[model samples]
Target: ASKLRAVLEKLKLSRDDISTAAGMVKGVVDHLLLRLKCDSAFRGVGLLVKISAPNEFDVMFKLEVPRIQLEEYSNTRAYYFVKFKKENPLSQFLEGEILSASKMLSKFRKIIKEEINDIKDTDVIMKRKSPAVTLLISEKISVDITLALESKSSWPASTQEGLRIQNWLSAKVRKQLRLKPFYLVPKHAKFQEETWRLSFSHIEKEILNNHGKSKTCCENKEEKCCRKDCLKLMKYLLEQLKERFKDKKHLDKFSSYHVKTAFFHVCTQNPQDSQWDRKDLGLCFDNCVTYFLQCLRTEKLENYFIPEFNLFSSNLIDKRSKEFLTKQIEYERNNEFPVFDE
Candidate 1:
């Protein structure tokens, strides 16, 4: 646990490193979007690509494309609002309900499939059952571009329990954030072609940016807490393990978001201003892992925003992979996480 403080330094992205790569990647995205807007068909129509910082360590940006404006502002319980062009075949499904996930990606593929492969020094690989076309810059960096739909509605009825930061944030701040819109990623559910997953990325970023019991917490050194630092450590731990097991692919479904969700839970559990003293960075990290392991063994890591959705669903991660992951983590825990050095 003593070394935990020393290891925290490694997880931070230097300002220069992040800005350099961020500029380069944004340039690549700008060029690609330009080409698509002017290319073979749909040439004159303007499209809006809302660029976002995806909070993950490796990929700093998430580029999302929404129509210039909503065909109509509305709300829904299950899916994001989407209306398609006349030639789109999903119109049949919509005459009855809404656009399917496969068709959205199919149209997106047709819209961008050819234009992006022409990017210099980058490999554009589109995987099956995926919404985003991954641009592998081996740019010794990566960026994921997705065709997303924006929902001007409130979140699901099931999420009334989320955004519970009463002890950490002011009630006024909470009310305003609730007014913020949500997004639907191109991912589908059990009906791989039919459903879309909800995303509160904007909300997550806002909270993390202002994550302190006091407004001056991080800035005020005398009263600092290790909450953010602890998260950084936990994220790096997962990143290193993924690289160590790069060939095994055992860590496929466990993204930084899972780590993030568990971290949020721990924050609420110990919301006292005195609970996360800055000096306890390592201990705080271990406490978060304790919660993570509890969720792992129980197979019940609920999505922080949507209680009904399971981030560790059988649909996303099978039972065997989960069990194997538990052992590797347990081994590393007993061994003081030797992989952090390797």
Candidate 2:
């Protein structure tokens, strides 16, 4: 009830606009997505990693505008398309009964075992030479995965089906490759315990204390380049990130994904907690970077993960800062081969 009242105050909307509690709930969801600017990316594509119990897996999925070139040429209309990698070992299991899915899983186990051994000994695919198998399963879709998953009855335990599956997958690959599982969301996904409080007195004291040191909008050349309003912007973005995750419409509007990540236990003593270990990320992003800005956030393929200038620029930074925040992140990613661990 208190949470409800706080939401009401924040929105400054009375119960008038909503026809029912259900409708009101949806409106709040819409408001949350709006502030997130979730569709800014337009389209998303990429791969995801999943570490299953007793085994680990890495797979790819993709999304794109089906007739994008036509729209690019004409600027008149557009359509969405989504595609999943056929070669993904799990693809065969998606449509069948539980027993059939299990049989396919056996075939998958054999094929993947051979592939892993090859990666351990030689190239699993042609023109490659490592245990890191690169199966480029190119399928094109007219829409994104988020929509497909959203319409389903219920997501699976993993983002393999549920929202958290992506993380589960990442952890698995890390284990198999003897790498460390690491990412930002696992730790920060839940709002901090102290997030509900904000005191006006504290705000005022901070404002007064920082007045001479920091000015939000720079007026003079004296304190040039100082980060004045940076705090506010970052805080707002954090809120937007939280709000975006809370709204499915926002999450799926620009991209479609059905992948998760998990790290192997051998590589990480605390594999279950990889999400909080900033050190586990290898060339992923800093703790402060919004994941939406990072490629592969949507669980698509390499083609879907076309890097923007800013992302490219970020990659070009000095290794230590750009690579991983902590030795732990580096430890998790360091192996001889560079496979798409997701």
Candidate 3:
């Protein structure tokens, strides 16, 4: 058990260097906007563009999940907003246009390709994922950039009844997140429509940045917390299992977000931070696993923010496969992750 804890301690990155690397990307966009200023299409609209990162330039500074080097391309998702002023003719209002996500992205693709000239040693390979501008940094680090906009449309209404974190996040913390913004995503069809998703990364990072029920948590005076450690271990477990049984269709649909959502739910269910005491890592980790297992069994893990959206919804995934996934995770838990041993 202690050895397991030892492994956990060892699994945790440089901040300045990584943050600097992240900043360079932001700077590149800054340059992009500057050069585009006074161009034909919108005539000096570049100055109107802004990039508001959740962490205030604290990009992937210290991501130490231990899965970075193992996979071919698994990395962070960071975004920049290309806000549209409805009066600027950039809001995509064609003959019945309500701002086409597809058109905006296509124009952006051309603009980026033409604008990107050099990136020092990395060559900067760009791939299209529609909603994201994928930058693969020599295989070791992949950065995701988004063309997010219309952030003033308010937070998701579906979540008004959800986000049951009053017991866990406190009234003050809860209000701040509630007051924060939401973003729109492109959906499926001939043309993509706007689907609002909560803009929670920066704040979430900030929360997990310090992350404790007490102000003194993980500080010079007090002890640590398990929110992140459990996260890493859960991520590692999921990663290894996925790698081991690469063909498991059930596992295919799953992502680390599910694990993260389940973890938060656990935190809320057991509001007192005592449940996640640094010393209780093993118990807490198992607690998260079982909670997720139950969710899979019922296929009913709601997206924590937007309660109506089911993460394990049958529309998104098959029911029987959920059963199979439950079986696999149960085995991993019972045997203490033999795949991890391998």
Each prediction's TM-score against the native? 0.77, 0.16, 0.77
Cα lDDT, all candidates? 0.64, 0.24, 0.58
Per-residue CA lDDT of model 2 for 1-342, tens digit only, reads 232223323443435532443343233323323332233221232222111111122222222212111101121011111123213332343332111212322443354445435443322222122022232211210111111011111111111211111232353432332221111100111122101100112222232233332233135544332122222222332343334445433222221111101111111222132232323232222222233223223232121111111221322333333322223223323431112122
lDDT of 1 by residue, 1-342 (tens): 667876765444465756866776676666666765564332332322111233212222223333312222132233344554224323443533455556545555665566555544455443333335655554235566665455556655656777777767777777888787666665544443455556777788888887777887778768788887778777877777777788979888787788889998888788765788876766787889888888888888888776666777786789887887788788878788787653
Could you list the CA RMSD of all candidates, in the order they appear? 5.8, 24.8, 9.3
Instruction: Give the lDDT of residue 315 in candidate 2.
Output: 27
Taking the candidates one at a time, how many backbone clashes does each contain?
Answer: 0, 44, 1
1 or 2, which is superior by lDDT? 1
